[PDB]
C-alpha cells in the first residue's frame, strides 16, 4: 500500500508515482500517473462514513458529478474503494489534473480582456448545463474554477450543490449560510435560503468583477459587512426592490441604513471593456428577479465571439431526500453509486 506523509494512499496498481497537494474537507489530495490513459491525474481521499452530514455531501456530489457530462464541469474518471461495504473505510475520487485554478491565477497574473471573455464564456456554458439539470452550484468562486495550461476551464466542488426549490426559498433575516461569504448574493443575508438559480448568477458577477481587477469586489469581513460592501457600490435598494422584502426585520434593517448612491462601474474599472461592464451590471443586480439568467448572459454582446447555442448543451436527465437517512444507509448508497468503477 502506497504511503504519502505517513497516511495510507492506497490507489494502485493503475495509479503510481504520487505527490501530496493538500487537505480537502474529508481528506487528503495527491497527483499520480494513470497507466491506462497515459496522463497524470488528481486523486482525493475521502473518509466520510462516521458522520451522516459528510455522507450526504459525498453522496450528493458523486451522484451529481456522475450524472453530468460536460466539457466545463469536472468529471469523475474513476472511484477506488474496497470490494465490500464492510471493508470500505475510504473512497478515492480520480479526476483530471488541472494545473491551476482562477484564484491562483488572479493572485499572480494579469488577465487580458480576451482571457476574461473566454473564462466568463466557459463558466456560463458550464452553468447553463448545471441549471438545465435543475441543480444549483451554490459555491461558485475562483478557487472552484480549475484551469489547465491551454485555459480550458472546469467548474468543481459541488459540495454545497442542491436541486433548485424556488417555492421553499424564503427564510428569515440573518439565516446562517454555508457558502463562501464574498460570492454570496445579497438576498442570502435578508430572506433567501439560496434555492434559486439567481444565487449562482450573482457569484458569476462577483467573479467577473474580480477578473477585471484581480481583487475580490465584495470582501466582507463578517455576515452584515458582506451587505454593506454590496450597497456601497450598487447604492441603496430602490423602493421597488424593497417591496420584494416582506420580512420586517430584513426590511427595517435596510431602511435603517444611510442612503448610498451607485458607484459607476466605469469608475471602478477604467480599463474594462464597456460590454463587460454592461453584462456585469446585469449579473450584479440587487433584486434577484431582475438579475439576468444564464442564457441571457451567454447571448450578451460581450460574449458574441463565443455564443453558439447549438454548442452549449443542456442536460439529458435533470434531477426531478437524503436529509433524514441514517449514515449506514448513506454508506450503502455510496457503495451502490460507486459500483460501476469496480473491476468487471
Alpha carbon 236 to chain centroid distance?
A: 28
> Cell 457558502 belongs to which residue?
179
32: annotated binding-site residue? no
Q: Are 105 and 146 a contacting pair, CB within 8 Å?
A: no
205: annotated binding-site residue? no
22: annotated binding-site residue? yes
Q: How far apart are CA 104 and CA 270, in angstroms?
A: 24
Nearest to 205 by CA among 272, 268, 141: 141
Residue 138 backbone zone (phi > 0: left; psi -120 to 50: alpha; other: beta): left
Q: How far apart are CA 130 and CA 95, in angstroms?
A: 18
Q: How far apart are CA 182 and CA 178, in angstroms?
A: 12
316: annotated binding-site residue? no
178: annotated binding-site residue? no
Nearest to 288 by CA among 181, 199, 222: 199
12: annotated binding-site residue? no
139 part of the active site: yes
185: annotated binding-site residue? no
21: annotated binding-site residue? yes
193: annotated binding-site residue? no
Active-site option among 139, 157, 200, 241: 139
Q: Are 213 and 280 a contacting pair, CB within 8 Å?
A: no
Backbone angles phi, psi at 215, to 5 degrees: -145, 145
Q: How far apart are CA 10 and CA 80, in angstroms?
A: 9
Q: How far apart are CA 152 and CA 166, in angstroms?
A: 32
187: annotated binding-site residue? no
Binding residues: 21-29, 44
Residues catalogued as catalytic: 139
Binding residues for ATP: 21-29, 44
Amino acid at each position: 500500500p502506497e504511503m504519502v506523509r505517513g497516511q495510507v494512499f492506497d490507489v494502485g496498481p493503475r495509479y503510481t508515482n504520487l505527490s501530496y497537494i493538500g487537505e480537502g474537507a474529508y481528506g487528503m489530495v495527491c497527483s499520480a500517473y494513470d497507466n491506462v490513459n497515459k496522463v497524470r491525474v488528481a486523486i482525493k481521499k475521502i473518509s466520510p462514513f462516521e458522520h451522516q452530514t459528510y455522507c450526504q455531501r459525498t453522496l450528493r456530489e458523486i451522484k451529481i458529478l456522475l450524472r453530468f457530462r460536460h466539457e466545463n464541469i469536472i468529471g469523475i474518471n474513476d472511484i477506488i474503494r474496497a470490494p465490500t461495504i464492510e471493508q470500505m473505510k475510504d473512497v478515492y475520487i480520480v479526476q483530471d489534473l488541472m494545473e491551476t485554478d482562477l484564484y491562483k491565477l488572479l493572485k499572480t497574473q494579469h488577465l487580458s480582456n480576451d482571457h476574461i471573455c473566454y473564462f466568463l464564456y466557459q463558466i456560463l456554458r458550464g452553468l447553463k448545463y448545471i441549471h438545465s439539470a435543475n441543480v444549483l452550484h451554490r459555491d461558485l468562486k475562483p478557487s472552484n474554477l480549475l484551469l489547465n495550461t491551454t485555459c480550458d476551464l472546469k467548474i468543481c466542488d459541488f459540495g454545497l450543490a442542491r436541486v433548485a426549490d424556488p417555492d421553499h426559498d424564503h427564510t428569515g433575516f440573518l439565516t446562517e449560510y454555508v457558502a463562501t461569504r464574498w460570492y454570496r448574493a445579497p438576498e442570502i443575508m435578508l430572506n433567501s435560503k439560496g434555492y434559486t438559480k439567481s444565487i449562482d448568477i450573482w457569484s458569476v458577477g462577483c467573479i467577473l468583477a474580480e477578473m477585471l481587477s484581480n481583487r475580490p469586489i465584495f470582501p466582507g469581513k463578517h455576515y452584515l459587512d458582506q451587505l454593506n460592501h454590496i450597497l456601497g457600490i450598487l447604492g441603496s435598494p430602490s423602493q421597488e426592490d424593497l417591496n420584494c422584502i416582506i420580512n420586517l426585520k430584513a426590511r427595517n434593517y435596510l431602511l435603517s441604513l444611510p442612503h448610498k448612491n451607485k458607484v459607476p462601474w466605469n469608475r471602478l474599472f477604467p480599463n474594462a471593456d464597456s460590454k463587460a461592464l454592461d453584462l456585469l451590471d446585469k449579473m450584479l443586480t440587487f433584486n434577484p428577479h431582475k438579475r439576468i439568467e444564464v442564457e441571457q448572459a451567454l447571448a450578451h454582446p460581450y460574449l458574441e465571439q463565443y455564443y453558439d447555442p447549438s454548442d452549449e448543451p443542456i442536460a439529458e436527465a435533470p434531477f426531478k431526500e437524503l436529509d433524514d437517512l441514517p449514515k449506514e444507509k448513506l454508506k450503502e448508497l455510496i457503495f451502490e453509486e460507486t459500483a460501476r468503477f469496480q473491476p468487471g
